[PDB]
Amino acid sequence: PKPYVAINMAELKNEPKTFEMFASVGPKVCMVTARHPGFVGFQNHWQIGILPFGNRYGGAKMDMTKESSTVRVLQYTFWKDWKDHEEMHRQNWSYLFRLCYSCASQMIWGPWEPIYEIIYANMPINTEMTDFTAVVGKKFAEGKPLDIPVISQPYGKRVVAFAEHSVIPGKEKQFEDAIVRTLEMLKKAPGFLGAMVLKEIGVSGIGSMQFGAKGFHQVLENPGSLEPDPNNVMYSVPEAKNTPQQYIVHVEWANTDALMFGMGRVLLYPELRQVHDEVLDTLVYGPYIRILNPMMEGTFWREYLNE
Amino acid sequence: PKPYVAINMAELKNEPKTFEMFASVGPKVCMVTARHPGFVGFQNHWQIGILPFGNRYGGAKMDMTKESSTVRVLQYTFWKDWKDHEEMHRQNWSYLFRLCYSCASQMIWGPWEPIYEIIYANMPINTEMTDFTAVVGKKFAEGKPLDIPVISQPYGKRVVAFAEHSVIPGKEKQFEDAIVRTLEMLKKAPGFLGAMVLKEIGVSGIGSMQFGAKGFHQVLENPGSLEPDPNNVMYSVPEAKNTPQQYIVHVEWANTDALMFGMGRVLLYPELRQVHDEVLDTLVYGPYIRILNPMMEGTFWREYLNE
Amino acid sequence: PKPYVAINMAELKNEPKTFEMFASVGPKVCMVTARHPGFVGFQNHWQIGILPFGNRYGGAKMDMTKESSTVRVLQYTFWKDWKDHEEMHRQNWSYLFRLCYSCASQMIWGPWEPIYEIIYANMPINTEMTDFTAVVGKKFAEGKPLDIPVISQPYGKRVVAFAEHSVIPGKEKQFEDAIVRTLEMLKKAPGFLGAMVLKEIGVSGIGSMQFGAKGFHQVLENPGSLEPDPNNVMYSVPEAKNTPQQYIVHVEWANTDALMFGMGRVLLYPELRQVHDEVLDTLVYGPYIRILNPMMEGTFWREYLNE
Amino acid sequence: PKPYVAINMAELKNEPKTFEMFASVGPKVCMVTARHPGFVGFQNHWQIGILPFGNRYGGAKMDMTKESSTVRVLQYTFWKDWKDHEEMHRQNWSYLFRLCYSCASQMIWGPWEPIYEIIYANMPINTEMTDFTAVVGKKFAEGKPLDIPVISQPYGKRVVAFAEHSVIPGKEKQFEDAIVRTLEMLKKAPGFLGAMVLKEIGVSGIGSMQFGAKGFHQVLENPGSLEPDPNNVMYSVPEAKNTPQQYIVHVEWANTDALMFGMGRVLLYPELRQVHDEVLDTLVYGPYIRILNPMMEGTFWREYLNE
Numbered sequence A, B, C, D: 001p002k003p004y005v006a007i008n009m010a011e012l013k014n015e016p017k018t019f020e021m022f023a024s025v026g027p028k029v030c031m032v033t034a035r036h037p038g039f040v041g042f043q044n045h046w047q048i049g050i051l052p053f054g055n056r057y058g059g060a061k062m063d064m065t066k067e068s069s070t071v072r073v074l075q076y077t078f079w080k081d082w083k084d085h086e087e088m089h090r091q092n093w094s095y096l097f098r099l100c101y102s103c104a105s106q107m108i109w110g111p112w113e114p115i116y117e118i119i120y121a122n123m124p125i126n127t128e129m130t131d132f133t134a135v136v137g138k139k140f141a142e143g144k145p146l147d148i149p150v151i152s153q154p155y156g157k158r159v160v161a162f163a164e165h166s167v168i169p170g171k172e173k174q175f176e177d178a179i180v181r182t183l184e185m186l187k188k189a190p191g192f193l194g195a196m197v198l199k200e201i202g203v204s205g206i207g208s209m210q211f212g213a214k215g216f217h218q219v220l221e222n223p224g225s226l227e228p229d230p231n232n233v234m235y236s237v238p239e240a241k242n243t244p245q246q247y248i249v250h251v252e253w254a255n256t257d258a259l260m261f262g263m264g265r266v267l268l269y270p271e272l273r274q275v276h277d278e279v280l281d282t283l284v285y286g287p288y289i290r291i292l293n294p295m296m297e298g299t300f301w302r303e304y305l306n307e
């Protein structure tokens, strides 16, 4: 079935100490999150650059890692019910806060953790290049050659287009209908590895370290080993849902060239351009497209998705 | 059928002279071992690092070869009957001892050669990337597409997780049942190339250069061209079997990222975590996981295994 | 009386940060251990090298500290009853775990903490070179000149031969009789500072950070300030006792030359060689001899020993 | 059908000028050879090294190109009838001599051009990694999945073991029977790309620039633009056939590791070792194994071979 998605977002200093700290803290956080039976996996991203749209963002390029002073992380966790995410954080708060707070020394902005529902998904299981022979053999043995997927390689061996959209109130249905038609046509582009549309349903205050006064002071004063009061979150997840409605169009690609020209198919192929124009007519903001590297991931979230 | 496994273990200086000596002496030892008809192949490993488990072993990394002052070798030989290994050593002692003793100038610890029975094996034949087209065609022509394996590349083009376990006396059946259930579920991870469970049955004194007093002095005094008395081994293979019972869980992977996150599936995927927890409850020691490079190998041992 | 000995073993990166951490954390751990009235002292060792036995381990030398990428520690704590060690760990768990876990960032292997009984001891009190005049005067005034010991200098000013043995099941009495006869003759070598024979009685799971599943996850997920459940150790100390039976022959020497040629007396002096040959005939493994520097120590453990 | 093979052999200075002239002269010679309708293709090799057989040739390694002062070339041309090669040389002598003579400035030894019959061949068509999808589709459409070959990549993207043998007079039948059995078993080795056995039938005097006195002086005196008398070759091809009988066992491999351990299967796998021992018992010389890079080739010779 379709899981819910929590996306923990933050900006940190782009230096080895940041990546060293992620190598030790990151796995621990994932192991704590896996204590909850509603956890179905994760996909953690480093932003490597920004899609320039020709020279609309002429100061950007798809890989800015050599020049950038910061690194943005977008850490997806997948949940049977979005309430499982909230329960997990509270049930494991003493571990989670102390682990997550240990990254504060590198932090420039965040954490900010919106929660999303998946309204469309065309996402395959990941396979390494070593696996495809057995996948093909099994699918043919089952008489299901149409179920043979593209090779979507895990652990940093593909790239993600993370396309931010906000929609004019009252045009959500037009946006959703047109973006699904767009993605159904986009899958013909070479190197397309899958797409999904995420629709924001709210924000996790506890995952964003957004408390009332009491917890705010406890966060600011923390030596690192004392939990803020997890009951001092002042709003539920849906209370923080944004209007204009926010969406993420998440598209995976074999490499950054396939991403650039593949996403570009909505501008360059006349039939698709007419369809995608219906998306553009509904927007308050966007599309703004971040280029992401999916490095650490728990690939079994796609097994839950595809049943 | 399942062969027995002898694993010759040693630690040597990490310097070019060590790898030069292995390039010339190593093949000679393998050729002598192949004189016995019970020999069914071999798989020789260099340890490249240690799995850090987040930062549980924070001084370790999966590839420590650039910094390490030593190199550990784990040389598997496969036998129709473990007694064939003992007979081979004695029948060819003048060659084997003089070849193996020539390594002494580089040696820091070893040799130590435990013997194992295989209690579980899910291991494919090795294939190079050039081979899969013919393998696929042959299996389909035979009507056995389910027998098409993953591509497990020989000669250093994959990695091994070598997981050491010792088990509380009386919990061996619980360990064995649970680890098999774990490995049957682990094979869904991307880049999984196979697994087997080795259970120690004893130690080869002659393969470990472990003699009584007479042979000990002959080893220490040796100019290099005089054999110690091979009859001066004071214990049979089973007499040295350890209690607590020792196991090796040997899992092969496409690359070190697939290894790290694939092995991590027993921690990150809740359903598998519950199964693997039954393994953890039985342990005196472990899991301690060495990262191995299978460089020199006689791949036909898997043909014997898979018949 | 003879205390029991717990030996905490670990391997860490050989870099200044490791020795800095030991200079601050080490004393803290010792002070916590001293909270228990059954604690009678300690003797902490750095391995400086390996005895090469001519060129049997030709890649080794007695001092490998300049080249080695790792450092092995062997931390002896002495106890009136071995159960005191287990009680101390649990009574002081919140301090001990957090202190010991702070070493994890430097750790490659360990901790592993076997427990031993002393079956033979000929070990003097330590004295500095400044002390011997008062020791001599006191012993003569008491009419006990035979109780004047050799000068065994504390705090890194002597060396230890740490000789590992494992014994064929059924040959333990032969080993023990012969090694005692050997050590009674070895004390004639110049620079001999004492010897003792340690016989393994089990392993401390809590001291080895070896828990069931619950504690294992708590260790891996730990931010550093949360204790694993100390009741989640799944085995008692005796349940982990190894067969083949393990022994440590611990011999102290004025310097590494006295060690090399003094230990060599069991090979070079014919009458002693015949006696020590009876030891060699009983072995599954060994002798493998580590060269240790006893740097930080609580010398009063020898006062308890010698009453 | 099986073509005949002419192998032009020479040794030249290992310097850029040699490879420059080969980049210009080599294609011209091949274009001239293709003027004859009996020409069915070619496969030109650079020797990159020598198989050391452990340390039997301890001064050798499989890739000596960085240290070698010379480069050996082995240029295979394939012919419907070996007489076609002789006719081609004479019909096109003014071009061929002047082209081939232009390499003399770099030459140390050669040219020497023995002629061979193929007595056994298991050689696939070459395919690039881009081609295999269409090859698989075509073979399944023909209902012949057993005809799907391994991927044997052209133009320097595989390696050749060139194994020289000379056979005791009267043992030719034993050699030929046993080598065919050996190669039929060797094809199980990973990365095996094909094998063929070439049996010398004679030597091309004209291709070897081996004339009588008249042509010898014309070669030595040549300014580069005057042909020696092509009728001054004093021996026919069969008149130069060697006794002891010479063979080449030509085996192709995915890479040099697959070659080393794959060819080693005749020494390391007991069942194959027994078969290959029947080859060894017949030899005057060899096996001596050159490691070759097949760079420039006309791959259609395998289309002729395979019908």
Ligand SMILES: [Fe+3]
Pocket: A006, A008, A077, A085, A089, A113, A204, A207
């Ligand atoms: Fe969260």
Ligand SMILES: [Fe+3]
Pocket: B006, B008, B077, B085, B089, B113, B204, B207
């Ligand atoms: Fe052996």
Ligand SMILES: [Fe+3]
Pocket: C006, C008, C077, C085, C089, C113, C204, C207
């Ligand atoms: Fe302890």
Ligand SMILES: [Fe+3]
Pocket: D006, D008, D077, D085, D089, D113, D204, D207
């Ligand atoms: Fe020719």
